[PDB]
Design a protein around this ligand. Structure first.
Ligand SMILES: Nc1ncnc2c1ncn2[C@@H]1O[C@H](COP(=O)(O)OP(=O)(O)CP(=O)(O)OP(=O)(O)O)[C@@H](O)[C@H]1O
Ligand SMILES: Nc1nc(=O)c2c([nH]1)N=C[C@@H]1CN(c3ccc(C(=O)N[C@H](CCC(=O)O)C(=O)O)cc3)CN21
Ligand SMILES: [Mg+2]
Ligand SMILES: [Mg+2]
Length: 410
């Protein structure tokens, strides 16, 4: 198979039941020589901020001289972005050869167990684990797909775990209460392994304190052990100060806007320091400053057009919507239009009340492959014609942001 066929092959996998015992992926992995049991890992979970945190942790450790695998989702411009090494997406040719190796092993399994199969995410995760070992990365930063305990990625023992935050999202999968969702996320916390977390709402904090008690894990929490005591906009980015039990690193800069990113970044920094410590590896404030400076992350409050002014974002659950509003409020001191593809979660109605309550013009649209408009293209055309003086912010799952970015830029 060539590259195009290979990708199409990856997207052809079935949606199987959700056991949560990882037997399917463990079967494929075993046939791949158990790459998940070799090397080192950093496991990242959380309702919002997983990718931004994972991306920065990788940049900081890369700056310190380590070869780092990064596994994130969803891709924004193209598939290859899901598996990166030192931030270079897996080469087309390399993906073709990788897909062929895994397919061959899969085939051998099916010839021994006639009805055996894996899901698309299971295939990709196994391929990623195998790829990271083939290239012998020093460490792989792994973003959990959904939840924590039952995710296909949860077949590893990391050096450090990360739980950015817990907010309501993915209920028909994780739970209907913060406590329930929290218990699922805490599942990536392992015996004796440190866990770095954001500032968690009380209910979630209790679940985590309870878990660390059982695992005996060292627990570093934003606003307790490490923090961001100062920050300010600096272009389409932020300049801030990080502080933890070792002191302060001043004048740090990240090319990201949104107050919540100060949290994601602080989590990344604390996490990388813990990694370096647990592995007896050198990590300087210079390494950290360099990595943060390189921490570009598409579709995260990204201005992709100046005239007209267009920003895209992936906020689509109430917490993200709340973070989005607060941010937009600090970024614009003029009327703006917001096009939201939140027509998906029940969550929808309340989020829309919050948007229309805070902004001048709000359009609601579906997500590609799912006030009212039939598509984001229609809402944009509407905005540019009825409110030409209003910048446009397009938000919803990253799938909508991605479709918009691909369309307007690639
Ligand atoms: N600490 C934080 N507090 C509040 N909001 C935050 C946040 N960190 C990130 N966000 C919001 O989430 C969006 C995506 O950020 P990230 O890529 O870091 O998220 P995740 O990796 O958790 C997304 P997904 O669940 O993979 O995707 P998908 O759900 O799109 O399928 C941002 O554009 C922003 O709206
Ligand atoms: N922009 C964009 N990004 C993606 O990562 C993406 C996309 N579009 N269009 C469809 C494919 C495949 N998608 C999937 C497939 C399976 C699971 C899963 O097994 N859970 C999640 C997302 C996301 N993929
Ligand atoms: Mg999500
Ligand atoms: Mg993500």
């Amino acid at each position: 198979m060539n590259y195009t066929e290979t990708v199409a092959y990856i997207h052809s996998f079935p949606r199987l039941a959700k056991t949560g015992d990882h037997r399917r992926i463990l079967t494929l992995l075993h046939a791949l020589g158990n790459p998940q049991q070799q090397g080192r890992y950093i496991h990242v979970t959380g309702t919002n901020g997983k990718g931004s945190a994972a991306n920065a942790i990788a940049h900081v450790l890369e700056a310190s001289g380590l070869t780092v695998g990064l596994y994130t989702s969803p891709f924004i411009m193209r598939f290859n972005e899901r598996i990166m090494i030192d931030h270079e997406p897996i080469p087309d040719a390399a993906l073709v050869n990788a897909v062929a190796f895994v397919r061959a092993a899969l085939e051998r399994l099916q010839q021994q167990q006639a009805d055996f199969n894996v899901t698309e995410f299971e295939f990709i995760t196994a391929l990623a684990y195998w790829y990271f070992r083939q290239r012998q990365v020093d460490v792989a930063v792994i973003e959990v797909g959904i939840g924590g305990d039952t995710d296909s990625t949860n077949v590893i023992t990391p050096v450090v775990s990360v739980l950015t935050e817990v907010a309501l999202d993915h209920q028909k999968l994780l739970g209907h209460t913060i406590t329930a969702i929290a218990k699922h996320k805490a599942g990536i916390i392992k015996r004796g392994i440190p866990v770095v977390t954001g500032n968690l709402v009380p209910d979630a904090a209790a679940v985590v304190a309870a878990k660390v008690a059982t695992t005996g894990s060292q627990w570093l929490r934003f606003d307790r052990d490490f923090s961001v005591p100062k920050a300010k906009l600096h272009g389409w980015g932020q300049r801030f100060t990080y502080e933890d039990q070792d002191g302060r690193i001043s004048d740090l800069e990240v090319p990201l806007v949104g107050d919540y990113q100060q949290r994601n970044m602080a989590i990344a920094i604390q996490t990388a320091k813990v990694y370096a410590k647990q592995t007896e590896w050198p990590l300087t404030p210079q390494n950290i400053r360099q990595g943060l400076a390189a921490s570009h992350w598409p579709a995260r409050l990204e201005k992709i057009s100046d005239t007209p002014l267009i920003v895209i974002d992936g906020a689509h659950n109430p917490d993200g919507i709340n973070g989005l509003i607060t941010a937009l409020k600090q970024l614009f001191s003029q009327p703006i239009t917001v096009i939201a593809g939140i027509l998906a979660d029940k969550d929808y109605a309340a989020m829309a009340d919050r948007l229309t309550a805070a902004f001048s013009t709000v359009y609601l649209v579906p997500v590609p492959g799912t006030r009212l408009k039939d598509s984001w293209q229609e809402a944009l055309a509407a905005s540019l014609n009825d409110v030409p003086d209003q910048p446009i912010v397009i938000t919803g799952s990253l799938y909508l942001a991605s479709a918009v970015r691909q369309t307007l830029l690639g």
